[PDB]
Design a protein around this ligand. Structure first.
Ligand SMILES: C=CC(=O)N(C)CCOc1cc(Cl)ccc1Oc1cc(Cl)cc(C#N)c1
Lengths: 406, 546
């Protein structure tokens, strides 16, 4: 065990030097209490000015607990960490009727780290108003949030649950960062039980008490639906034509001209138009096209997953995951009943989408958030609750395609 | 002799691949050579330096500088080449405390510790790359070589290493004197205690001994520097703080540096305006650019504003913390942060970003986040806001805005000009309103095109236009329908561009066509704007492309 698995960066890169950002006084207090046992347990140790490396750090509440937990934004070290090429995605996991997420990075801390690399895991607890220099630190053990911390423990971990999953050759087990995704075809009771069993089985070799329940969705890509009316106003047809024209980029074979013929003429917008026999037929063929899924849409593990999110109003949010535009791998809608805080809702939605994305492909996506950078930058860490963090960017033009995903 | 505890060296290396420095010792004057030997012999006496033999290939130059009228000379070493090759360090003084962030204390002592710079060892392994040679007289004797045993004055490593060690010593003293508060900026210490000036005065003693236990010199008499402390361009007083008053051919320097100067004054001076001059900087380095007889209008409330001297107070953690915002016009916002009325902790302004269009409600939101971020820096909490916007206005805005958005806890303050929503598009077609199908088009060569509409009542118009583009004409066509329609109107466009502009709800724009539409929307009761795909022969989709 004493051997520390050697690690390096990818050729020709320096370790992270990222500004720590301001933290509120109560989160500073919490990281103080937290980071005082982490030294007393040798998990971290103080450093001096010889170390210029720096990785941001802050504090969260995880689910249904008032105990502050600490996160490090390993995003710049994780893209500078060696490939760690030294785990074909469990496609069984995305089909299981239930899947529970278990926190396992609570025990990454029992293994040391190559003395040469700790310098790259450097962070600062910050002080209010710059009154004191920051409390700097470095990791001695394997840190939660590091891209190498599952890779290094993947050997020890397979021997951990080797008794399990030889008893239960159906329950699919997956692992991403500090999370263990265990999925079952068993019914809710049978899953809720085999869960508690795999819990204590972790204790013998050991925030493990927390877990999530998540079940699959009927449609990976939800269908595009056209209205079913007995009378159509000009406005109704105008929206219909606009939506079928948009769907023509995804589903070629969509024809609109017989519907457009009913529009010619300067009729008032609220006037009912009777549909012609031609137009009624064209609407019918157009449905049949939309009943089939989009054809020849394949995932590509080399490529990046893009996620787009629209705010719909009334706590509803629609999203789409794709690599190439108009070829969605998944599409979905998250709703509610906050309802005062748009940003709270958005950051949960980004969280749900990322977790789904870990269950399906085992890699998180890149978001295009309908939010202003400075606003999102200010508040997201107040609602974030996952031990990982995707990448993101910001959408500053109102896409007119929001209602078409309504 | 009482043994001084030793100061652990800091492991220091150079940049990888770069071996180190070698610099030609400059030809000096015999006076300068006679002077420099005196210092080094006295420095060697102290242990600050040591002679080095013929095994060191790294040379750092050393010249001499007389102390102005003072007859005593002073030696300088240019490690500028050792610095270009020295390793990287963690700097921590990347930001200056803000006076408004300090808690009021009965007593406050300032101790200079810049002396101990040289009381701090050096990594013996690195004492070599710092090495200098003193030119012998007449170049007839082998030159004298020397190295440093302590952090040299010009070495890039010396600040960061001093501060790290200096912190390490102080941690036990502060843990055992919780009744005091120590702050360390850069070679300075700032002790503050709500204690009887007698008890406080002796805990300053204890501290100097603690630092002496490690061999750190520090002043006892003539260290008071009693308030007013002159510090980082402020004047701090026991109950109040302020800024040290700092200073035809309006040279670009009268603009390039005066920008940050007037901004500096506006952390406590309310209503300091610095925008018209920022336009004068343009994208320029030497020019007496005009005052536009409009930028000088701010000086009549700027130079007249620095007359009545303004003070801020220190922070009290027990009261609430409150920020209030005023719209100043021209994308300008001011705020005050305070705990009791008119006793400001500090003030500020918010500069609008470079938008093509924009509205007040977005400008306000950004000002809120900026104040939010600054307050967390300075106090570790967000203030409660007083904002000139009705709650109704805020609800309608955020609930119908297509982006996510949020303001922390806040209240309506009814100082005008209030921030309002100027117009509001309908969600559904308006029964009984005339329907204008508008269209516009231009020719990429001639810059010539038409703009007009056709309606369900047979109303029609086409205007021809010179020197124009498809985007201008699509907008003009909407503008035509707004002028010629009544108080309630349904508009159909094929312009995705025109929609994008209006679905962002500007209330001011750089394009004067956009402002005329906006001004038309304001006079309307109900406007429904509907998009359709172009070239699908839809209803009255055009006449405007001839
Ligand atoms: C009653 C006097 C008075 O000046 N105050 C109450 C202001 C609060 O000053 C301190 C509050 C505390 Cl808690 C510790 C140290 C403080 O003195 C500082 C802090 C700094 Cl950054 C710089 C300097 C300098 N020069 C002094």
């Amino acid at each position: 065990p004493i051997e520390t698995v050697p690690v390096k960066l990818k050729p020709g890169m320096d370790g992270p030097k990222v500004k720590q950002w301001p933290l509120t006084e109560e989160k500073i207090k919490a990281l103080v209490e937290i980071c005082t046992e982490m030294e007393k347990e040798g998990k971290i140790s103080k450093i001096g000015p010889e170390n210029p490396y720096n990785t941001p750090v802050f504090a969260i509440k995880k689910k249904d607990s008032t105990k502050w937990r600490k996160l490090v934004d390993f995003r710049e070290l994780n893209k500078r960490t060696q490939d760690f090429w030294e785990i074909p995605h469990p496609a069984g996991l995305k089909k299981k009727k239930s899947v529970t997420v278990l926190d396992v990075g609570d025990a990454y801390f029992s293994v040391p780290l190559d003395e040469d690399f700790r310098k790259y895991t450097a962070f600062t607890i910050p002080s209010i108003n710059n009154e004191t220099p920051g409390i700097r630190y470095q990791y001695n053990v394997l840190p939660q949030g590091w891209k190498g911390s599952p890779a290094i423990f993947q050997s020890s971990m397979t021997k951990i649950l080797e008794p399990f999953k030889k008893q239960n050759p159906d329950i699919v087990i997956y692992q991403y960062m500090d999370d263990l995704y265990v999925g079952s075809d068993l019914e809710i009771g049978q899953h809720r039980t085999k869960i508690e069993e795999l819990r204590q089985h972790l204790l013998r070799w050991g925030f493990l008490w927390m877990g999530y329940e998540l079940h699959p969705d009927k449609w990976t890509v939800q269908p595009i639906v056209l209205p079913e009316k007995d009378s159509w106003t000009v406005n109704d047809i105008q929206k219909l034509v606009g939506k079928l024209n948009w769907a023509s980029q995804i589903y070629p074979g969509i024809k609109v001209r017989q519907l457009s013929k009913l529009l010619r003429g300067t009729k008032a917008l609220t006037e009912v138009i009777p549909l012609t026999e031609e137009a009624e037929l064209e609407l019918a063929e157009n449905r049949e096209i939309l009943k089939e899924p989009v054809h020849g849409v394949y995932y590509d593990p080399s490529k990046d997953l893009i996620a787009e999110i629209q705010k719909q109003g009334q706590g509803q949010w629609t999203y789409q995951i794709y690599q190439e535009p108009f070829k969605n791998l998944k599409t979905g809608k998250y709703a509610r009943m906050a309802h005062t805080n748009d940003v709270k809702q958005l950051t949960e939605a980004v969280q749900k989408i990322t977790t789904e994305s870990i269950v399906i492909w085992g890699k998180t996506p890149k978001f295009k958030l309908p939010i202003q950078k400075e606003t999102w930058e200010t508040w997201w860490t107040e609602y974030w609750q996952a031990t990982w963090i995707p990448e993101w960017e910001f959408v500053n033009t109102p896409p007119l395609v929001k209602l078409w995903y309504q | 002799m009482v043994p001084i505890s030793p100061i652990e060296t800091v492991p220091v290396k150079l940049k990888p691949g770069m071996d180190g420095p070698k610099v030609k010792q400059w030809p000096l004057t015999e006076e300068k050579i006679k002077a420099l030997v005196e210092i080094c012999t006295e420095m060697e006496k102290e242990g600050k330096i040591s002679k080095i033999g013929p095994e060191n290939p790294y040379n750092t130059p050393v010249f001499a500088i007389k102390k102005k009228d003072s007859t005593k000379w002073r030696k300088l070493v240019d490690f500028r080449e050792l610095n270009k090759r020295t390793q990287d360090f963690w700097e921590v003084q990347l930001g200056i405390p803000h006076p408004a962030g300090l808690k009021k204390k009965k007593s406050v002592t300032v101790l200079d510790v810049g002396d101990a710079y040289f009381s701090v060892p050096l990594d013996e392994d690195f004492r070599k790359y710092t090495a200098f040679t003193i030119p012998s007289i007449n170049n007839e004797t082998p030159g004298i070589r020397y190295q440093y045993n302590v952090l040299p004055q010009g070495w890039k490593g010396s600040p960061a290493i001093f501060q790290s060690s200096m912190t390490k010593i102080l941690e036990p003293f502060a843990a055992q004197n919780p009744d005091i508060v120590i702050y360390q900026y850069m070679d300075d210490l700032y002790v503050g205690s709500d204690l009887e000036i007698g008890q406080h005065r002796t805990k300053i003693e204890e501290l100097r001994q603690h630092l002496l236990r490690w061999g750190l010199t520090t002043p006892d008499k003539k260290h008071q520097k009693e308030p007013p402390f002159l510090w980082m361009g402020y004047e701090l007083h026991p109950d109040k703080w302020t800024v040290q008053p700092i200073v035809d051919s309006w040279t670009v320097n009268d603009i390039q540096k005066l920008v940050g100067k007037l901004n500096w004054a506006s952390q406590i001076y309310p209503g300091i305006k610095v925008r018209q001059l920022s336009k004068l900087l343009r994208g320029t380095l030497t020019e007496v650019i005009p005052l536009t007889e409009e930028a000088e209008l701010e000086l009549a409330e700027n130079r007249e504003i620095l007359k009545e001297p303004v003070h801020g107070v220190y922070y009290d953690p027990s009261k609430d913390l409150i920020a209030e915002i005023q719209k100043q016009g021209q994308g300008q916002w001011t705020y005050q942060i305070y705990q009791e009325p008119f006793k400001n902790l500090k003030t500020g302004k918010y500069a609008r970003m470079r938008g093509a269009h924009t509205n007040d409600v977005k400008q306000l939101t950004e000002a809120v986040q900026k104040i939010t971020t600054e307050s967390i820096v300075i106090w570790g909490k967000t203030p409660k806001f007083k904002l000139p916007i009705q709650k109704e206005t805020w609800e309608t805005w955020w609930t119908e805005y297509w982006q996510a958005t949020w303001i922390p806890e806040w209240e309506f303050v009814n100082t005008p000009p209030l921030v309002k929503l100027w117009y509001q598009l309908e969600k559904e077609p308006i029964v009984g309103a005339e329907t204008f199908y508008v269209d516009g088009a231009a020719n990429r060569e001639t810059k010539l095109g038409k703009a007009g509409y056709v309606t369900n009542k047979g109303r029609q118009k086409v205007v021809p236009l010179t020197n124009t583009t498809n985007q201008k004409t699509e907008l003009q066509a909407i503008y035509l329908a707004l002028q010629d329609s009544g108080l309630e109107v349904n508009i159909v466009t094929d312009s995705q561009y025109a929609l994008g502009i209006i679905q962002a709800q500007p209330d001011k724009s750089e394009s004067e066509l956009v402002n005329q539409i906006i001004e038309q929307l304001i006079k309307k009761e109900k406007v429904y704007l509907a998009w359709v795909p172009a070239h699908k022969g839809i209803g009255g989709n055009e006449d405007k492309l001839v």
